[PDB]
Amino acid sequence: APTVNTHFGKLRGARVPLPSEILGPVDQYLGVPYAAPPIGEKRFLPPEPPPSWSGIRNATHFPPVCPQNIHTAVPEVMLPVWFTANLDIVATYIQEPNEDCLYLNVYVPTSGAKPVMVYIHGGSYMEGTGNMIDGSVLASYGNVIVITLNYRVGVLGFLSTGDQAAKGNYGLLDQIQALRWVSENIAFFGGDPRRITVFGSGIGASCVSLLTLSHHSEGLFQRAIIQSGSALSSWAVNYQPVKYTSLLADKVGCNVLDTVDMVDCLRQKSAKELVEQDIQPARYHVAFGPVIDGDVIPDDPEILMEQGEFLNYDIMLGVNQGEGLKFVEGVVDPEDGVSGTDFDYSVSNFVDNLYGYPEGKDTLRETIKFMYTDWADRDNPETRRKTLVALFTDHQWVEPSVVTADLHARYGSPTYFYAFYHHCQSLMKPAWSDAAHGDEVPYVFGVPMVGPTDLFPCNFSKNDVMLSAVVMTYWTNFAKTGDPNKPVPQDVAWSKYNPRDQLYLHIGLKPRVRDHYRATKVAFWKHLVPHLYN
Amino acid sequence: APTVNTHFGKLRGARVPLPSEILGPVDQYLGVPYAAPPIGEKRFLPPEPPPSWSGIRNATHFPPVCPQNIHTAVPEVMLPVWFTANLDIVATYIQEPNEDCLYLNVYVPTGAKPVMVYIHGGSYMEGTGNMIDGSVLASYGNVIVITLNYRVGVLGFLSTGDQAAKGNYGLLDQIQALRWVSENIAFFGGDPRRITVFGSGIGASCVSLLTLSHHSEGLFQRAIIQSGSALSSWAVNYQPVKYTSLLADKVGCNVLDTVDMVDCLRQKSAKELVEQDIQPARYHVAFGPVIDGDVIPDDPEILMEQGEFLNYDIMLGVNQGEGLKFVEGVVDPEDGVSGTDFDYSVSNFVDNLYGYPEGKDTLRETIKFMYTDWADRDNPETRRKTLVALFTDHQWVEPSVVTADLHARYGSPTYFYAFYHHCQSLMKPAWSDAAHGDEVPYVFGVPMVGPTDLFPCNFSKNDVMLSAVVMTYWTNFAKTGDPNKPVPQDVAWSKYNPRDQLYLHIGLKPRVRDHYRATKVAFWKHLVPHLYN
Ligand SMILES: *[C@@H]1O[C@H](CO)[C@@H](O)[C@H](O)[C@H]1NC(C)=O
Ligand SMILES: *[C@@H]1O[C@H](CO)[C@@H](O)[C@H](O)[C@H]1NC(C)=O
Ligand SMILES: *[C@@H]1O[C@H](CO)[C@@H](O)[C@H](O)[C@H]1NC(C)=O
Ligand SMILES: *[C@@H]1O[C@H](CO)[C@@H](O)[C@H](O)[C@H]1NC(C)=O
C-alpha cells in the first residue's frame, strides 16, 4: 500500500514490478488532480488549484482524457507515425473522454532526492494523452521521477477570440499549473524540485519550446529537452485564432453581437459538440493552438528567443533523419520511387501552401527544385523520394530547431543538439523509410527493455535495447546534472553545441560527434530563401 | 643529313639527341612554310598554298613569329601562368617578328606513325608554337608532333562584319596548315589517316572551333581539348565591327566604306597595327574568331547540337585551379580573402559577365550562397579557394562539360579529365592548385629533360612518373582513339557519357570518378539562366 502525503491530501498509489528482472519495481500514482476541473464557468478560464480531500485518495486507475476525437479529421502530417499507424490501439486509451481531465501520472523508482522529468505529450494540439506512455522503464533505469500529464486540447484548450473574452493558451496554462504542482509537491515523492526537466516530442516539444519563452513558467523548471519540434514551425502558433473561432461559432450556431456573449454561449454547448466540428485550417497550419496573447506568449516566439528569456534553461534538442515521411507517402509508387512530374508537383504545391503565391514565386520554386535535386544521380526515382522527404524535414524541423539551438547557445549557455538516425523495424512504416516523426520516443522511454507493446509492435533486436539504454542514459544524465555525460558513463562524449563549432550528436547504433548538421541546407532556408522573394 | 621530299620541294632538317638516355633521338624540321606569305594584297585574305623551291631547303632554325607585342597590354587572366611568370624568356622567342610567319615545325621519331598537331594560344594576340619542343612527346610516344605558327591579333582576326574583311584568318591558317600535313606528312613517315589536333587554353578554344567547321572536314580525325572551349566568354568575339572601327580611328584609317578602310589598313605597317592599345570588355576579346557564316556558320553551341563534331574522337578536360588570376589581386599575406573582398569580387564578376540586367541583385546573392562553405563560413583561406572555383567553374568547367555532354550525346567516343597535379616553383603561389597551363609540361614530357628556361620547375621523380603516364594516355588516344590502347600503364580511363559522367582524375594517383563538380556545373547550366531575363 504505497502512500504519499501532499499539500491537498494523502493519496494511495500502486507498486508495480517491471517484467525485466534487472530493473527494479516502481511506485506509480495515476490520476492526481493538479487543478480544479475546468467545467461550467471554469471553461475557457485559466486553471485553478484543486480542492483538498480529507481522507486517503485513490490513485490506482487512469482518469478520463480531455475531450477529443481521433476519428474527426486532424492534420495527418503533424501526428507521429506510431500514432496514426495504430489508431485502433490508441482508441482504447481515448474512450470515454471527460472535460474533467486535468490530471497527471507519477512514476517513482524504489540515493538522495531524485530528479524529475515532466513529459508533455502532443499530436496536433487537438488530441493525445500522457496515459499512452508508461514512464516506468525510464524511471527505474535512470533513477529519476517521470511524470506524464493531461492538458486541455483543441477548442477547449486553445479557443481564442483575439481579445479579453477568450485570451486562449489554456492548454499551456494547464502545463504551467501542472509544473507548479510538481515544484511545490514532488518533494513529497522524494523528488527534487530544484532539478526539474520538462521534455516533449513533436507538438509536445513545440509546447516545451513555448514554455521556455514565457514569463509564467519562470522559476518552475531548470532544463528542457525539445524533441522534433519548435516554437518556429508553421504549425506551432496560430496567427489567425479570430478567423477559426468565428467559424466554430457559426457551426454551433453561437453567433452573437458581443464576443463576451458568444464565449458564454459556447459554455452552454456540450463539450462533445465543440470537439467534433470539422474545422480545417490552411495546409501545414493549425486552426486551434497557442496564440500570441501578449501575456503567456508576449510576442512572436522568435523575438522572444532573441530577448534571451529561455537562456536560463539547460536545453537539449534534436531531430530525426526522415521526419517528413508523410509529405511524400502519397506519391511513392510500388518501386519506391517518385517521378519527375510528381517531384515538380509536390515542390510547387509546397511553395503554394507555405509561401502563398507572392512576387517572384516562380523564381523561388525553381531554386527549391535545384537545391533538392541530386545532380550526381538526376534520374534516380528512389533518391528523388529521399530529397523530397528531406525538403520537408529540413524546412519544418531541422532549420527551425537549428535556429533555436543557435539562439539559445548564443552566449554560451548550455545547449546540446542531436540527429536521430535509427528506428525500429516494423509494419507501421514503409521499409525504405528512415527515422520518422516520433520514432525516437520508444528508445527514450525504454520500450525495447520490455519488448513489443500494443502501441509499439516493433520487432526489437539486441541492438535496439543497447541503444535505448544509451539514449536513456544520456537523457536522465541531462536531467540530473545538465550534462548528458555526467554522472553515469556509457558502458563517445556528447559535446556542447555552439553557433561557431556547431557540434551535434549523431544518435544511431553507430554513435559519434559531428558538426554543422545539414548546414548548407539550413543556410538555404535561413538566409537565401528570405532574399529570393520581396 | 636528314632529308625529306615534299610536294613543294626537298628540305633538310637536323637530327637531335635527347638528354634522356632512355629516349631515342628525333629528326626535327623547323620553319616549313605551309602557306604563301600573307602580306601586301595577301593580308586580310585566306591563306594560299606556298610556292615551290628549287633547291634543298635548310630547316634547322626557327623562322620569325607572327606580328605581336608582349609588352603591349592584353588580358592577363587569359594567359597561362608559365607564360606571364617568365615574360623575359618568352621575349627571346618573340624577338624579330615578321608578317611572313606561316611556318610549322615537325618532330619525327627515329609502320606509319600517328600525327599530333599542336595549336598554341595565349589570347589570340600573341604566342608561337616555337616555344614548345615536341621532341620528348615524339620520342617517348613514338608519334609525329607538329607545332605551328598562325596569324594572331589584328592580322589574324580583324573583321568588318561584312565582305571587306570576313575574319577568322588565324583559324583559316590552322586549316591550311592541317591540309599541308594531310597531303605531305606521309613523306615524313606519318599516317594522314591518324591525325590528332590538340591545344591548351585559347589554343583549345581554336581546336573546339575547328571541329565545328565545314572547312576542317576530312583533315583530322581526333581532337584533344585542354583547358578551353568554344563556349567561354572570350572564345568568340560578338562585336567585331565595334573594335575594328576603334582600330581604324587610332591608325587614322577610318572611312564610311568598309572596302576602303580595309584597303587603307593594308597600307599600314604590320608594326603599327599591333602596338595599338585596344582593350575589350572584361573577360571578353577585341580581336578573335567571329561568326562569319562561313568558317563559323553559327553560334558555337548551336553547331554542337547540329552534330558537326560527332565524327571526331574527342578528349577534353580542365585543371583544379584554372582561375588563379581571378583572385590573385585580393589575396592578403595570410593567404586569405576578406568577406568584404569576397562580396566585392563576386559583385564585380556579375557586373562584367551579365551586365546589370533585371534581377541581378537576386542572382548576385545566389552566386554568393552557392560558393560559400557554410561548414566553415569564417575561414579566409577557404574563401579564397571558393573564389578561385567560382571563376574556374564558370569559365572552364561548365563550358567544357557542356561540350563533353553534347559530343557524347549519341555515344561517339569522348573522354573527360580533371588535372589535379602541378610542379613546384616560384612561378605560382605555394597555396595554389594546378593553374592555367600547368598541364602543358607533363603533356610534353618536360620532367624527362629536367628544368628548362620556360619551365623552371623542380621536377621530382613523381613528376617524371606522371608525365610518362599522361603522355602514354595522350599518344595512345592519337594511335587508336582510345587512351588505354595499345600501350598499357606499367588504371583504365573510362568513356564519358551524359548519364554516367565518368572522368579521369589526373594526379599522382590516377582514378576514375563521376559527375565532376556536377552540382556546381548544374548551377551555371540550369538554375542561373532562370533568375535573370
Ligand atoms: C479506494 O479503493 C479501495 C479498493 O481498491 C477501496 O477499498 C477504498 O474504499 C477506496 N477509497 C475511496 C476513498 O473511495
Ligand atoms: C518480426 O520478426 C520476425 C522474426 O522473429 C520477422 O519474421 C518479421 O519480418 C519481423 N517484422 C518486421 C516488420 O521486420
Ligand atoms: C643550315 O642552317 C643552320 C642553322 O642552324 C646553319 O648553322 C648551317 O650552317 C646551315 N647549313 C648549310 C649547309 O647551309
Ligand atoms: C626546388 O626543389 C626543392 C626540392 O628538391 C623544392 O623544395 C623547392 O621548392 C624547389 N624550388 C623551386 C624554386 O622550384
Side-chain angles (χ1 to χ4, degrees):
Chain A
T3 52
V4 158
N5 225 321
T6 85
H7 284 162
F8 299 91
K10 324 222 280 297
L11 39 75
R12 186 179 282 105
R15 177 175 261 94
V16 55
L18 300 199
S20 162
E21 186 202 350
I22 319 186
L23 299 176
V26 306
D27 290 13
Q28 66 190 21
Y29 306 77
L30 312 174
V32 177
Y34 67 78
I39 60 176
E41 295 304 322
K42 301 311 173 181
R43 181 191 281 174
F44 301 147
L45 240 57
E48 292 163 12
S52 313
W53 55 91
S54 65
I56 297 185
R57 177 175 191 114
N58 272 329
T60 43
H61 81 118
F62 277 120
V65 304
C66 288
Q68 63 186 273
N69 190 303
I70 61 177
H71 296 350
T72 54
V74 299
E76 59 169 356
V77 284
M78 258 163 100
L79 305 181
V81 161
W82 64 262
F83 186 93
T84 49
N86 291 353
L87 276 155
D88 319 87
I89 282 67
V90 171
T92 83
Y93 288 87
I94 305 310
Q95 59 188 14
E96 300 278 55
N98 204 262
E99 193 169 16
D100 189 349
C101 60
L102 304 187
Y103 302 83
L104 52 82
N105 311 298
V106 179
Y107 304 83
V108 185
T110 55
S111 170
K114 298 134 139 40
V116 181
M117 297 185 74
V118 179
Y119 190 81
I120 304 180
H121 70 82
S124 71
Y125 295 123
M126 306 286 296
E127 296 163 355
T129 174
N131 298 181
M132 265 168 310
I133 293 144
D134 176 23
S136 298
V137 184
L138 184 57
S140 185
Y141 176 84
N143 195 38
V144 293
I145 288 177
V146 182
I147 294 174
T148 58
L149 57 83
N150 270 97
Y151 58 95
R152 268 178 289 183
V153 299
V155 175
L156 299 184
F158 299 100
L159 178 133
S160 174
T161 57
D163 52 24
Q164 293 300 82
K167 297 176 206 179
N169 297 319
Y170 309 112
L172 291 170
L173 290 172
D174 289 3
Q175 279 151 245
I176 310 284
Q177 171 62 21
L179 287 178
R180 289 196 199 288
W181 192 98
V182 176
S183 185
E184 302 180 3
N185 289 265
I186 205 61
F188 291 117
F189 293 86
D192 186 353
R194 297 185 185 178
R195 297 190 293 170
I196 297 179
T197 303
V198 302
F199 66 135
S201 178
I203 274 306
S206 295
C207 284
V208 176
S209 283
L210 286 164
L211 295 189
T212 61
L213 306 182
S214 205
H215 269 357
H216 292 237
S217 36
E218 196 192 337
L220 304 174
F221 60 97
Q222 295 65 53
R223 322 190 218 281
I225 298 179
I226 301 174
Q227 308 174 190
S228 309
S230 74
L232 303 170
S233 54
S234 61
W235 54 50
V237 174
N238 173 21
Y239 288 84
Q240 322 205 41
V242 44
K243 161 198 168 109
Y244 291 108
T245 301
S246 40
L247 257 53
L248 172 67
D250 275 351
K251 295 228 179 163
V252 286
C254 261
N255 60 92
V256 307
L257 295 173
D258 263 40
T259 42
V260 195
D261 287 324
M262 72 142 295
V263 171
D264 211 68
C265 175
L266 290 183
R267 258 153 195 145
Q268 319 291 358
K269 299 294 204 205
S270 64
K272 183 178 170 306
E273 192 169 352
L274 304 178
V275 172
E276 315 264 78
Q277 297 306 306
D278 188 8
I279 305 169
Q280 281 160 283
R283 216 174 186 185
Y284 310 128
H285 286 73
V286 181
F288 296 104
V291 302
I292 301 171
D293 59 337
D295 184 23
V296 187
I297 309 301
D299 207 346
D300 291 341
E302 171 133 8
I303 290 178
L304 296 188
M305 301 204 186
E306 289 163 2
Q307 296 184 353
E309 179 75 56
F310 68 144
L311 296 167
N312 275 140
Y313 304 103
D314 308 326
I315 277 172
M316 171 187 295
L317 67 174
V319 294
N320 304 344
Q321 177 172 29
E323 303 265 356
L325 175 73
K326 293 175 181 176
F327 176 70
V328 321
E329 232 187 347
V331 183
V332 177
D333 58 32
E335 288 70 25
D336 291 353
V338 175
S339 85
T341 66
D342 281 334
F343 179 92
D344 289 11
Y345 184 65
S346 43
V347 168
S348 195
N349 249 281
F350 165 90
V351 180
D352 299 332
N353 302 319
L354 281 308
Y355 297 85
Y357 292 94
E359 296 179 353
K361 183 195 192 276
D362 205 34
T363 300
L364 176 145
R365 207 219 326 288
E366 214 66 49
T367 318
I368 313 306
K369 252 191 268 175
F370 171 80
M371 287 301 307
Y372 286 95
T373 293
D374 188 352
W375 298 97
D377 203 344
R378 195 174 172 185
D379 296 312
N380 195 337
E382 283 179 68
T383 289
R384 195 174 298 141
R385 176 200 75 226
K386 287 190 201 194
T387 63
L388 223 37
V389 168
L391 191 169
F392 198 67
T393 301
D394 293 346
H395 183 272
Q396 291 302 97
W397 280 279
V398 187
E399 190 268 357
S401 206
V402 165
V403 166
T404 294
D406 279 348
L407 279 175
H408 184 252
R410 164 202 276 200
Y411 293 138
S413 38
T415 314
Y416 295 88
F417 193 92
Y418 70 83
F420 212 92
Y421 274 64
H422 182 60
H423 60 113
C424 74
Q425 71 179 130
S426 82
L427 302 184
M428 280 179 293
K429 196 176 62 279
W432 48 258
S433 55
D434 301 317
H437 196 48
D439 280 345
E440 88 286 348
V441 173
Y443 300 96
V444 171
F445 288 111
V447 177
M449 302 254 186
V450 175
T453 82
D454 273 296
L455 208 48
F456 300 102
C458 300
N459 293 0
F460 301 111
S461 64
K462 290 181 179 298
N463 278 317
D464 284 322
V465 168
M466 187 271 295
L467 181 138
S468 181
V470 168
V471 172
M472 291 193 294
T473 299
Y474 277 133
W475 255 243
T476 62
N477 272 5
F478 181 71
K480 311 189 234 245
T481 74
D483 189 324
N485 308 287
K486 301 176 180 179
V488 180
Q490 300 290 358
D491 278 30
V492 193
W494 191 344
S495 293
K496 202 135 86 181
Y497 176 93
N498 58 88
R500 299 185 183 182
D501 276 15
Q502 299 210 3
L503 303 178
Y504 70 97
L505 183 63
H506 172 109
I507 296 152
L509 297 179
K510 296 188 179 65
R512 48 169 290 173
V513 180
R514 287 161 109 157
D515 58 283
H516 301 76
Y517 183 69
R518 305 187 63 76
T520 55
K521 295 301 186 318
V522 168
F524 176 70
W525 290 116
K526 183 46 171 207
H527 297 295
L528 186 51
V529 173
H531 260 285
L532 306 189
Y533 64 91
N534 297 109
Chain B
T3 51
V4 159
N5 225 321
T6 86
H7 285 160
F8 298 89
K10 323 222 279 296
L11 40 75
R12 186 177 282 154
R15 183 173 272 185
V16 53
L18 300 200
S20 162
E21 191 198 351
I22 319 186
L23 299 176
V26 305
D27 290 13
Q28 66 189 21
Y29 307 77
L30 312 174
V32 178
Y34 66 78
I39 58 176
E41 295 304 323
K42 301 311 173 63
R43 181 191 282 174
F44 301 146
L45 240 56
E48 292 162 12
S52 313
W53 53 90
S54 64
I56 298 184
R57 181 174 193 114
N58 187 330
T60 39
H61 81 118
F62 280 120
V65 304
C66 289
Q68 62 186 273
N69 189 303
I70 61 177
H71 295 350
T72 54
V74 300
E76 58 171 357
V77 283
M78 258 163 100
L79 305 181
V81 162
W82 64 262
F83 186 94
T84 49
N86 287 347
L87 276 156
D88 318 271
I89 282 67
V90 170
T92 83
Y93 288 87
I94 305 310
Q95 59 189 14
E96 299 278 55
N98 204 261
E99 194 169 16
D100 189 350
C101 60
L102 303 187
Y103 301 83
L104 52 82
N105 311 298
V106 178
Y107 304 83
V108 184
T110 54
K113 296 135 139 41
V115 182
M116 297 184 74
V117 179
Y118 189 82
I119 303 181
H120 70 82
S123 71
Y124 296 121
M125 307 286 296
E126 71 291 328
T128 174
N130 298 181
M131 264 169 310
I132 293 144
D133 176 24
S135 298
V136 184
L137 183 58
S139 185
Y140 176 84
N142 195 37
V143 293
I144 288 177
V145 180
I146 294 174
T147 58
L148 57 82
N149 270 97
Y150 58 95
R151 269 178 289 183
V152 299
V154 174
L155 299 185
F157 298 101
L158 177 134
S159 174
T160 57
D162 52 24
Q163 294 300 82
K166 291 225 317 217
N168 297 319
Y169 309 113
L171 291 170
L172 290 172
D173 289 3
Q174 279 151 64
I175 308 284
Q176 171 62 21
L178 287 178
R179 288 196 198 289
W180 191 98
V181 176
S182 184
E183 302 180 3
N184 289 265
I185 206 61
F187 292 117
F188 293 85
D191 186 353
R193 297 184 185 178
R194 297 190 293 170
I195 297 179
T196 303
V197 301
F198 65 130
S200 178
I202 275 305
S205 295
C206 284
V207 177
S208 283
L209 285 164
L210 295 189
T211 61
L212 306 182
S213 204
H214 271 357
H215 292 238
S216 36
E217 195 194 338
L219 305 174
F220 60 98
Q221 294 65 54
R222 321 190 218 280
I224 300 179
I225 302 173
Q226 308 173 190
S227 310
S229 74
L231 303 170
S232 54
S233 60
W234 55 51
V236 175
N237 174 21
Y238 288 84
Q239 322 205 41
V241 44
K242 161 198 168 109
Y243 291 109
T244 302
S245 41
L246 257 53
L247 172 68
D249 274 351
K250 296 230 179 311
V251 288
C253 200
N254 61 92
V255 307
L256 291 171
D257 184 285
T258 42
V259 196
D260 286 325
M261 74 141 49
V262 171
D263 211 68
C264 176
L265 289 183
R266 257 154 195 146
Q267 320 290 358
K268 301 295 203 205
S269 64
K271 178 180 168 305
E272 195 165 351
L273 303 178
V274 170
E275 317 265 77
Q276 299 307 306
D277 188 8
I278 304 169
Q279 281 159 283
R282 216 173 186 185
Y283 310 128
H284 286 74
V285 178
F287 297 104
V290 303
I291 301 171
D292 60 337
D294 184 23
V295 188
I296 309 301
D298 207 346
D299 291 342
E301 171 132 9
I302 292 178
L303 296 188
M304 301 204 186
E305 289 163 2
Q306 296 183 353
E308 178 74 56
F309 68 140
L310 296 168
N311 52 48
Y312 303 104
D313 307 326
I314 276 172
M315 171 186 295
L316 67 174
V318 293
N319 303 343
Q320 177 173 29
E322 302 265 356
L324 175 74
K325 293 176 181 176
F326 175 70
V327 320
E328 232 187 347
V330 182
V331 177
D332 57 32
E334 294 76 28
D335 289 354
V337 175
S338 84
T340 65
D341 281 334
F342 179 91
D343 289 11
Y344 184 65
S345 43
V346 168
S347 195
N348 249 280
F349 164 90
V350 177
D351 299 333
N352 302 320
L353 281 308
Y354 296 86
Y356 292 93
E358 295 181 353
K360 183 193 191 275
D361 206 34
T362 79
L363 180 144
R364 208 219 325 288
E365 214 66 49
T366 318
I367 313 306
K368 252 190 267 175
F369 170 80
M370 288 301 307
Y371 286 95
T372 293
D373 187 351
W374 298 96
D376 203 344
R377 196 173 172 185
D378 296 312
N379 195 337
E381 283 179 68
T382 290
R383 291 175 182 172
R384 177 200 76 225
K385 285 190 200 194
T386 62
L387 222 38
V388 167
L390 191 169
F391 199 67
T392 301
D393 292 346
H394 183 272
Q395 291 302 97
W396 279 279
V397 187
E398 190 268 357
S400 205
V401 166
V402 166
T403 295
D405 279 348
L406 279 175
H407 184 251
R409 164 203 275 200
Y410 293 139
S412 38
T414 313
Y415 296 88
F416 194 91
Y417 71 83
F419 212 93
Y420 275 64
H421 180 58
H422 59 163
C423 74
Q424 72 179 131
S425 83
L426 302 184
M427 280 179 293
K428 197 176 62 279
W431 48 258
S432 55
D433 301 317
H436 196 49
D438 280 344
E439 88 286 348
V440 173
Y442 299 97
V443 171
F444 288 112
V446 178
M448 301 254 186
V449 173
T452 81
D453 273 296
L454 207 48
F455 300 102
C457 300
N458 285 354
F459 300 111
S460 64
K461 291 181 179 298
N462 278 317
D463 284 322
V464 168
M465 187 271 295
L466 182 139
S467 181
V469 167
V470 171
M471 291 194 294
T472 299
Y473 277 135
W474 255 244
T475 61
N476 272 5
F477 180 71
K479 311 189 236 236
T480 74
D482 190 325
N484 308 287
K485 300 176 180 179
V487 179
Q489 302 290 358
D490 277 329
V491 193
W493 191 344
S494 293
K495 202 134 87 181
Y496 177 94
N497 58 88
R499 54 178 178 188
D500 275 15
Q501 299 210 4
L502 302 178
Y503 70 98
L504 183 63
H505 171 108
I506 294 152
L508 299 98
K509 286 191 175 65
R511 47 169 289 174
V512 181
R513 288 162 109 156
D514 57 283
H515 301 77
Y516 183 69
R517 303 186 62 76
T519 352
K520 294 301 187 318
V521 168
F523 176 70
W524 291 116
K525 181 46 171 207
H526 297 295
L527 186 52
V528 174
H530 268 287
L531 306 189
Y532 71 104
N533 298 107

